Amino acid sequence: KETAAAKFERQHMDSSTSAASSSNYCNQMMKSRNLTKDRCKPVNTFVHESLADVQAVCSQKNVACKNGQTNCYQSYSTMSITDCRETGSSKYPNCAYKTTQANKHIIVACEGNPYVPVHFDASV
Ligand SMILES: Nc1ncnc2c1ncn2[C@@H]1O[C@H](COP(=O)(O)OP(=O)(O)OP(=O)(O)OP(=O)(O)OP(=O)(O)OP(=O)(O)O)[C@@H](O)[C@H]1O
Ligand SMILES: Nc1ncnc2c1ncn2[C@@H]1O[C@H](COP(=O)(O)OP(=O)(O)OP(=O)(O)OP(=O)(O)OP(=O)(O)OP(=O)(O)O)[C@@H](O)[C@H]1O
């Protein structure tokens, strides 16, 4: 149905905008990317950079993953990101999100040959 690297791109890449254009960005994008299909995904981050720039994080600062694996990496530079978090007024299937646009470092887990992002761990 989907490989981990393609799922990462679907859930986390928005190379087509430099930032969230409106407070409704998350509401639109979490629907469009099919993150509201069977439940409201409670938190998600979109990265406004090229896939290459995000893949390159896999060779940057090695850091511990939240789950305790050691295959996580922190971006040297900040990156334009948009944090999407479910609101309290949100109830499936009417998923509602707060949109937060910021410059943060991203932390992703990388696997495979080629070594590519497969999980978005945090932004710092
Ligand atoms: N170091 C690592 N290396 C490889 N895979 C890793 C990993 N740490 C976690 N995972 C995988 O991800 C899920 C954990 O996620 P968590 O339990 O911590 O919360 P979650 O809501 O994200 O659940 P899922 O939307 O099902 O997970 P993903 O499909 O990978 O979406 P994701 O990339 O995380 O989006 P963001 O919300 O973070 O922005 C698990 O299935 C886990 O096996
Ligand atoms: N060890 C390394 N090995 C390989 N490539 C490396 C690297 N360090 C950086 N790069 C790459 O060179 C370009 C410039 O990066 P640079 O790191 O040289 O500029 P930068 O201005 O972006 O850094 P800093 O203000 O020093 O960062 P921090 O002080 O830690 O926090 P904060 O200021 O808030 O955020 P950011 O400013 O980073 O966005 C980037 O493309 C980056 O990927």
Numbering used by the authors: 1 to 124
From the paper:
With the new chain-extended nucleoside oligophosphates in hand, we go on to investigate in detail their interaction with ribonuclease A, a model protein containing a polycationic active site and for which X-ray crystal structures are relatively straightforward to obtain. Thus, we go on to investigate in detail the interaction of the polyanionic constructs with ribonuclease A, a model protein containing a polycationic active site and for which X-ray crystal structures are relatively straightforward to obtain. This work presents a combined experimental and quantum chemical approach to understanding the interactions of RNase A with the new nucleoside hexa- and heptaphosphate constructs. To better comprehend RNase A and nucleoside oligophosphate interactions, we examine the correlation between the experimental and calculated protein–ligand interactions by combining efforts in crystallographic and computational investigations in the present work. The combination of the CCSD(T) approach with the appropriate energy decomposition scheme enables deciphering the influence of the oligophosphate chain length and of individual polypeptide and nucleoside residues on ligand binding.
Here, we demonstrate by extending adenosine monophosphate (AMP) and uridine monophosphate (UMP) to their corresponding nucleoside hexaphosphates, while adenosine diphosphate (ADP) and uridine diphosphate (UDP) are phosphate chain-extended to the corresponding nucleoside heptaphosphates. In the presence of Mo(NCMe)3(CO)3,35 [PPN]2[TBA]1 readily reacted with anhydrous NMPs and NDPs, yielding the corresponding hexa- and heptaphosphates after subsequent hydrolysis. Anion-exchange HPLC purification of the resulting compounds provided the ammonium salts of adenosine/uridine hexaphosphates (50% yield for p6A and 29% for p6U) and adenosine/uridine heptaphosphates (24% yield for p7A and 17% for p7U). This result represents the first direct chemical syntheses of nucleoside-5′-hexa- and -heptaphosphates. Additionally, we found that the hydrolytic ring-opening process exhibits less selectivity when leading to the nucleoside heptaphosphates as compared with that leading to the nucleoside hexaphosphates, with observed formation of pentametaphosphate and NDPs. Aqueous solutions of the purified nucleoside hexa- and heptaphosphates were observed to be stable for at least a week, as confirmed by 31P{1H} NMR spectroscopy.
